[PDB]
Amino acid sequence: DATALVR
Amino acid sequence: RTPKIQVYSRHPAENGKSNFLNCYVSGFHPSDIEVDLLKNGERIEKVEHSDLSFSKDWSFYLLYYTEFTPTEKDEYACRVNHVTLSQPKIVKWDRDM
Amino acid sequence: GSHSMRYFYTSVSRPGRGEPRFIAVGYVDDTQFVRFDSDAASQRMEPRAPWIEQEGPEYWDRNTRNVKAQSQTDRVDLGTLRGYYNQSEAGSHTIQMMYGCDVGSDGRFLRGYRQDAYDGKDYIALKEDLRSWTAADMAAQTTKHKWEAAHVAEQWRAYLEGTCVEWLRRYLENGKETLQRTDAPKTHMTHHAVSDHEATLRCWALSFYPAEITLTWQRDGEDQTQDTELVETRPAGDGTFQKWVAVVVPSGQEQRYTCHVQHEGLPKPLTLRW
Ligand SMILES: [Mg+2]
Ligand SMILES: [Mg+2]
Ligand SMILES: [Mg+2]
């Protein structure tokens, strides 16, 4: 099951 | 970060028996790469490849493959071009490797 | 024994026209089980193993939304990182990220990881503690300062120790027929004369799973490293792997050389002689 903030 | 190349058959080769010709390209960066499988110096049309993935050091790898029948006379090879290569790299298929 | 689940994401900018190319692949050990490719027709996360095909429509919707969301985050990040590195808008650049977890024989959490790279070089990685970040350079340090303030590592820790291991346990159960089965290498030796007085002996290991294996030569019971060639483990294309190791020997002395094969699928290491 895959999963997130900007760099 | 030049591609490392292995050309080989899925199964031990027997002249006249259907098999799969593989060209495994690895250790390369960036991901853009040109890979052709050749029969007697000519590009084979029905070539598929694996979904792009990479190793711990971030270098990419792909498997290109097609069905083929090894014979006494036909010469098979893999032809690779990439930004790190000046000219295309041709690796001949040898059933012993 | 121990098992792992890993996702691999790659985004490649297309400065000539359009959005970046985004590819995602998921693995359980050495088995690919899902893929997403922004150039494919479905625009969905797709099954690549028979044991995942059983998952409900909600699983496929959630996984699709998640990778499409990351592909957009990567597109924004490619722009941000181009600025950090003072790069032109004309060249193609890459962001890669790998993340996953390992569980033991009993299904308990062992390790978690989440690391990323820009143009094939480490950028930012979650440390083994799953609490702090390793920034490889000053551009990654800018990201680390923003993420330290925004509970990013906490969210990754919750996923890697929870969701990640729970789903890995389910996959291992559902796909036990193949995922928990070892395929021992089918081994054989070939002989190739190099002259009338020397020959290469090549020890083959075929059709094995998982990919981890050790192939070594011994001469009179001691390790032989001279005149040997060991190829990188390679995929057969049917889910199994291949490897060979070769040594050049004087003709008539073949019996001194033994090839030793170590694999999870073999209770006792294998010994081959010509
Ligand atoms: Mg690796
Ligand atoms: Mg023939
Ligand atoms: Mg003999």
PDB file of N, CA, C and O in Angstrom, chain C residues 19 22 35-46 60-61 63-65 67-68 71-72:
ATOM      1  N   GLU C  19       4.489  17.714 -19.089  1.00  0.00           N
ATOM      2  CA  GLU C  19       4.673  17.356 -17.682  1.00  0.00           C
ATOM      3  C   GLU C  19       5.792  16.301 -17.582  1.00  0.00           C
ATOM      4  O   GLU C  19       6.017  15.551 -18.532  1.00  0.00           O
ATOM      5  N   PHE C  22       6.448  10.171 -15.001  1.00  0.00           N
ATOM      6  CA  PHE C  22       6.491   9.596 -13.654  1.00  0.00           C
ATOM      7  C   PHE C  22       6.262   8.093 -13.715  1.00  0.00           C
ATOM      8  O   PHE C  22       5.271   7.663 -14.312  1.00  0.00           O
ATOM      9  N   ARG C  35       2.462  -1.299 -10.547  1.00  0.00           N
ATOM     10  CA  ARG C  35       3.173  -0.290 -11.334  1.00  0.00           C
ATOM     11  C   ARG C  35       2.227   0.866 -11.637  1.00  0.00           C
ATOM     12  O   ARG C  35       0.995   0.676 -11.709  1.00  0.00           O
ATOM     13  N   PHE C  36       2.818   2.038 -11.897  1.00  0.00           N
ATOM     14  CA  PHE C  36       2.087   3.187 -12.374  1.00  0.00           C
ATOM     15  C   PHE C  36       3.021   3.850 -13.372  1.00  0.00           C
ATOM     16  O   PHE C  36       4.213   4.014 -13.102  1.00  0.00           O
ATOM     17  N   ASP C  37       2.510   4.177 -14.540  1.00  0.00           N
ATOM     18  CA  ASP C  37       3.346   4.884 -15.515  1.00  0.00           C
ATOM     19  C   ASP C  37       2.497   5.994 -16.076  1.00  0.00           C
ATOM     20  O   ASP C  37       1.461   5.696 -16.649  1.00  0.00           O
ATOM     21  N   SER C  38       2.914   7.275 -15.903  1.00  0.00           N
ATOM     22  CA  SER C  38       2.167   8.433 -16.415  1.00  0.00           C
ATOM     23  C   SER C  38       1.977   8.379 -17.951  1.00  0.00           C
ATOM     24  O   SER C  38       1.031   8.996 -18.456  1.00  0.00           O
ATOM     25  N   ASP C  39       2.838   7.639 -18.685  1.00  0.00           N
ATOM     26  CA  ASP C  39       2.660   7.490 -20.148  1.00  0.00           C
ATOM     27  C   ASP C  39       1.687   6.348 -20.518  1.00  0.00           C
ATOM     28  O   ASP C  39       1.340   6.204 -21.687  1.00  0.00           O
ATOM     29  N   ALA C  40       1.267   5.528 -19.551  1.00  0.00           N
ATOM     30  CA  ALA C  40       0.336   4.432 -19.861  1.00  0.00           C
ATOM     31  C   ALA C  40      -1.113   4.950 -19.970  1.00  0.00           C
ATOM     32  O   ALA C  40      -1.420   6.020 -19.445  1.00  0.00           O
ATOM     33  N   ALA C  41      -1.983   4.193 -20.677  1.00  0.00           N
ATOM     34  CA  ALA C  41      -3.379   4.552 -20.934  1.00  0.00           C
ATOM     35  C   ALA C  41      -4.289   4.581 -19.719  1.00  0.00           C
ATOM     36  O   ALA C  41      -5.120   5.470 -19.621  1.00  0.00           O
ATOM     37  N   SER C  42      -4.174   3.609 -18.808  1.00  0.00           N
ATOM     38  CA  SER C  42      -5.083   3.506 -17.676  1.00  0.00           C
ATOM     39  C   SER C  42      -5.073   4.696 -16.722  1.00  0.00           C
ATOM     40  O   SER C  42      -6.129   5.009 -16.177  1.00  0.00           O
ATOM     41  N   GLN C  43      -3.886   5.341 -16.476  1.00  0.00           N
ATOM     42  CA  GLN C  43      -3.765   6.421 -15.487  1.00  0.00           C
ATOM     43  C   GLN C  43      -4.159   5.889 -14.105  1.00  0.00           C
ATOM     44  O   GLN C  43      -4.663   6.617 -13.253  1.00  0.00           O
ATOM     45  N   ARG C  44      -3.897   4.583 -13.882  1.00  0.00           N
ATOM     46  CA  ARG C  44      -4.214   3.925 -12.626  1.00  0.00           C
ATOM     47  C   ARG C  44      -2.998   3.131 -12.167  1.00  0.00           C
ATOM     48  O   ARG C  44      -2.224   2.693 -13.001  1.00  0.00           O
ATOM     49  N   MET C  45      -2.907   2.855 -10.872  1.00  0.00           N
ATOM     50  CA  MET C  45      -1.952   1.891 -10.324  1.00  0.00           C
ATOM     51  C   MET C  45      -2.491   0.533 -10.848  1.00  0.00           C
ATOM     52  O   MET C  45      -3.706   0.294 -10.752  1.00  0.00           O
ATOM     53  N   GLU C  46      -1.622  -0.300 -11.470  1.00  0.00           N
ATOM     54  CA  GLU C  46      -2.024  -1.580 -12.082  1.00  0.00           C
ATOM     55  C   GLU C  46      -1.422  -2.786 -11.360  1.00  0.00           C
ATOM     56  O   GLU C  46      -0.264  -2.717 -10.940  1.00  0.00           O
ATOM     57  N   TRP C  60      -7.330   0.168  -5.142  1.00  0.00           N
ATOM     58  CA  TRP C  60      -6.882   0.699  -6.425  1.00  0.00           C
ATOM     59  C   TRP C  60      -7.110   2.169  -6.542  1.00  0.00           C
ATOM     60  O   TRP C  60      -6.242   2.850  -7.084  1.00  0.00           O
ATOM     61  N   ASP C  61      -8.237   2.681  -5.995  1.00  0.00           N
ATOM     62  CA  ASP C  61      -8.517   4.127  -5.998  1.00  0.00           C
ATOM     63  C   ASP C  61      -7.527   4.879  -5.099  1.00  0.00           C
ATOM     64  O   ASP C  61      -7.017   5.918  -5.513  1.00  0.00           O
ATOM     65  N   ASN C  63      -4.462   3.844  -3.965  1.00  0.00           N
ATOM     66  CA  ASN C  63      -3.107   3.747  -4.506  1.00  0.00           C
ATOM     67  C   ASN C  63      -2.914   4.655  -5.689  1.00  0.00           C
ATOM     68  O   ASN C  63      -1.865   5.308  -5.802  1.00  0.00           O
ATOM     69  N   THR C  64      -3.953   4.774  -6.537  1.00  0.00           N
ATOM     70  CA  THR C  64      -3.898   5.679  -7.680  1.00  0.00           C
ATOM     71  C   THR C  64      -3.812   7.136  -7.250  1.00  0.00           C
ATOM     72  O   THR C  64      -2.991   7.855  -7.793  1.00  0.00           O
ATOM     73  N   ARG C  65      -4.666   7.574  -6.313  1.00  0.00           N
ATOM     74  CA  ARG C  65      -4.653   8.955  -5.814  1.00  0.00           C
ATOM     75  C   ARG C  65      -3.283   9.276  -5.209  1.00  0.00           C
ATOM     76  O   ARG C  65      -2.762  10.361  -5.447  1.00  0.00           O
ATOM     77  N   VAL C  67      -0.154   7.847  -5.738  1.00  0.00           N
ATOM     78  CA  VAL C  67       0.945   8.025  -6.720  1.00  0.00           C
ATOM     79  C   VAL C  67       0.695   9.209  -7.627  1.00  0.00           C
ATOM     80  O   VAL C  67       1.664   9.832  -8.070  1.00  0.00           O
ATOM     81  N   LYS C  68      -0.581   9.516  -7.965  1.00  0.00           N
ATOM     82  CA  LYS C  68      -0.812  10.726  -8.798  1.00  0.00           C
ATOM     83  C   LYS C  68      -0.439  11.986  -7.991  1.00  0.00           C
ATOM     84  O   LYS C  68       0.148  12.904  -8.558  1.00  0.00           O
ATOM     85  N   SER C  71       3.291  12.332  -7.997  1.00  0.00           N
ATOM     86  CA  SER C  71       3.783  12.776  -9.311  1.00  0.00           C
ATOM     87  C   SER C  71       3.683  14.289  -9.444  1.00  0.00           C
ATOM     88  O   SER C  71       4.572  14.917 -10.030  1.00  0.00           O
ATOM     89  N   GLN C  72       2.633  14.884  -8.858  1.00  0.00           N
ATOM     90  CA  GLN C  72       2.453  16.343  -8.869  1.00  0.00           C
ATOM     91  C   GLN C  72       3.419  17.004  -7.909  1.00  0.00           C
ATOM     92  O   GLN C  72       3.966  18.048  -8.235  1.00  0.00           O
TER      93      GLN C  72
END
